[PDB]
Amino acid sequence: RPNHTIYINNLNEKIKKDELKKSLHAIFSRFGQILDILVSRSLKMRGQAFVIFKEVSSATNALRSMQGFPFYDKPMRIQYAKTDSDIIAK
RNA sequence: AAGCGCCAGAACU
RNA sequence: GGCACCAUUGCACUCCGGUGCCAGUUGACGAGGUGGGGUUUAUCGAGAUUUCGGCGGAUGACUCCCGGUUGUUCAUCACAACCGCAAGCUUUUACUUAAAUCAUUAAGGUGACUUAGUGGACAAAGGUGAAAGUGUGAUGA
Ligand SMILES: O=P(O)(O)OC[C@H]1O[C@H](O)[C@H](O)[C@@H](O)[C@@H]1O
Ligand SMILES: [Mg+2]
Numbered sequence: 001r002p003n004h005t006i007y008i009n010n011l012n013e014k015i016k017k018d019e020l021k022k023s024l025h026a027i028f029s030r031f032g033q034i035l036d037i038l039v040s041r042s043l044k045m046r047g048q049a050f051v052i053f054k055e056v057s058s059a060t061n062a063l064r065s066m067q068g069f070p071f072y073d074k075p076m077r078i079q080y081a082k083t084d085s086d087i088i089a090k
Numbered sequence: 091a092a093g094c095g096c097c098a099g100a101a102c103u
Numbered sequence: 104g105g106c107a108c109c110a111u112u113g114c115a116c117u118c119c120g121g122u123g124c125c126a127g128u129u130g131a132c133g134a135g136g137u138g139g140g141g142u143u144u145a146u147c148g149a150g151a152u153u154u155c156g157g158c159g160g161a162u163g164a165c166u167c168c169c170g171g172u173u174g175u176u177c178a179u180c181a182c183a184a185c186c187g188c189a190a191g192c193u194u195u196u197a198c199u200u201a202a203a204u205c206a207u208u209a210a211g212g213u214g215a216c217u218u219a220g221u222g223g224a225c226a227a228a229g230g231u232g233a234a235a236g237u238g239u240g241a242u243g244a
């Protein structure tokens with residue numbers, strides 16, 4: 001179902017952790033207030049992100065508008081997160 | 091300101 | 104930490120697949136010490152993940168040569184042990200700021216770590232002064 005956090009994958013792996021967190025705060029700021037973007041570069045989490053919006057409504061507009069968007073030469077793939085992130089739980 | 095300086099191994103990022 | 108390649112299309116709150124090539128970082132805490140030449144693996148303790156491993160210095164040690172001191176006062180040659188603006192040996196005696204580690208808390212840095220402050224201590228060698236003992240002979244004098 002719908003969620004506060006959108007799971008983004010198919011992102012370019014060659015890009016550093018910190019500059020990516022700012023590169024997709026540059027785009028997803030349009031849809032609403034972003035709390036924290038979580039990005040790793042490990043074998044598991046290589047080329048995927050978890051952008052956390054304040055409101056769910058913003059995450060839906062983000063999924064609708066940014067689906068298939070070419071970002072670092074690669075079209076983004078956005079799904080809703082399977083579970084709630086441990087910052088919305090509070 | 092001379093147990094002082096440097097950094098090729100090693101170790102850690 | 105960073106580029107190239109290999110492999111990965113995937114739900115997470117102390118980092119975290121692999122090799123290669125770079126890059127960065129750590130890599131001695133104070134005390135002490137220089138007549139000249141040779142020789143050599145260069146003094147003292149503190150700490151305890153590398154203060155390890157490598158290279159460079161270096162005031163060490165010995166050994167000779169040079170120059171001295173002391174050997175009861177001032178002089179020459181021996182000899183003896185010393186010393187390199189100090190100087191025979193023994194017996195005793197104050198001065199001789201340790202600094203890091205430790206603990207802590209700010210600053211910078213992506214991070215490894217770095218700078219600095221604060222708290223409190225704890226050395227050895229050395230050296231510099233008391234004092235009692237004591238150490239030549241010849242030659243002149
Ligand atoms: O300590 P090393 O890396 O062996 O270096 C050699 C010398 O280093 C320093 O100079 C020390 O004061 C000497 O005591 C030591 O002989
Ligand atoms: Mg030092």
Ligand SMILES: [Mg+2]
Nearest residue numbers: 091093133134
């Ligand atoms: Mg010193």
Ligand SMILES: [Mg+2]
Nearest residue numbers: 131154156157
């Ligand atoms: Mg060394």
Ligand SMILES: [Mg+2]
Nearest residue numbers: 144158159160
């Ligand atoms: Mg050496």
